[PDB]
Amino acid sequence: MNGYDPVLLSRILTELTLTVHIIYATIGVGVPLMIAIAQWVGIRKNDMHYILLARRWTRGFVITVAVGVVTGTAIGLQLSLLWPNFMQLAGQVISLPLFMETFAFFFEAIFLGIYLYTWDRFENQKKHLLLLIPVAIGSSASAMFITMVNAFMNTPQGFELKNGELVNIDPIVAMFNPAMPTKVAHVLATSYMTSAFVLASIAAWHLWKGNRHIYHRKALHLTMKTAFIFSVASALVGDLSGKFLAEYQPEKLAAAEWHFETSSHAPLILFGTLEEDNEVKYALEIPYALSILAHNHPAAVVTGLNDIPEDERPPLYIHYLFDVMVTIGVFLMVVAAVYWLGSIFRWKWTAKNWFFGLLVAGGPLAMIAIEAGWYLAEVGRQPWILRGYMKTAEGATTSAHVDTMLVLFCLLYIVLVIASATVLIRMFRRNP
């Protein structure tokens, strides 16, 4: 246990860091797009209220960004620290994208900084749109490149194993692996979406309470509509990624949907409870999706989990996450799909609290679905790294340091999150 506790403690710490990181990140990814769009709408419409929401957002986008950065550094460093032998092999291959994430981030950060400190000096709004285009591009570029890491972690190749030593590396093969498309896509979509619901959750708060129709109805009207779109795309690329899994890594998917047994027409599950050792409790399941319109043939035989080695299978508590993530997906999509439809273009329900409440919950639900989803996609992953890559069990270092540093960091982040939330509310209540 002087070099096995960390096998767990590390996982635990890393979770605690990155879990935080993401709160301050998908915002970093989705917000700038929304900002760009708001500017663009304000410009195209000559409505200098949207143009106020762009900066009204940016002003906090900053604070989000920084907290993002520090946690980013944290994880960045923690990487090789907690998992040396991993990087001993794969570092050669991961090095680049990881860099390109932050490069893309600096590239965006320049223009972000320009807009931030030229919108109050130099000329014309288009010339500030053109500064806000590179930002979102650089944001999504981060995600592309950094996700290419995870995507690669999930799947080879671009390497060769000389009795353990990883060599003969092709950049773009390892970078542009089979998972990369679905990862990049689903991640971008479910991060445009998330922030899209996050802004709606401000507009619905501010509009619900001190009903300054002014910005706060326009905000909702846009953010909700875009949120709908992004949730739809998100779901599409969800089905896509699911199909990818069903074809290439059903170890996850079969654990997500508890398909121990391999079959042609295999029903999905809405929610259940199988305690790790075959204890089927709540059982609500429907016939199969990722075959009928995905594979175009309902009787496409889904691989079963039994057919996966039990040293190669991930946990069964994964299902719950799929439930969470997907159901949030659909529900939230519905809320979105109604708001603009029914609450605006039909029966003027906007001013009803019955929406504003749900729309206040909107963003938090999405972020939850984010954390959940990440847990799902990453935890279906623990028992493969130990094979085609290298033993997870033999990836960590020492115990009596990690256990404490974990708690130090725990505290640190606890403070971060809270403080950030506080300041980030204070600002909005100051109304600049």
């Binding site: 195209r44 089979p178 896509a185 689903h186 979509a189 795309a233 599409l236 199909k243």
Partner: peptide
């Protein structure tokens, strides 16, 4: 190939749809 490419497409679409909202039912309506 089609389903390996498709996602990013769907995304790209969703983006410019998300823009197109700003022109359709934002600029000339509501």
């Amino acid at each position: 190939f089609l389903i390996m490419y498709a996602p990013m497409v769907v995304v790209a679409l969703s983006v410019v749809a998300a823009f197109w909202v700003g022109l359709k039912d934002v600029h000339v309506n509501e």
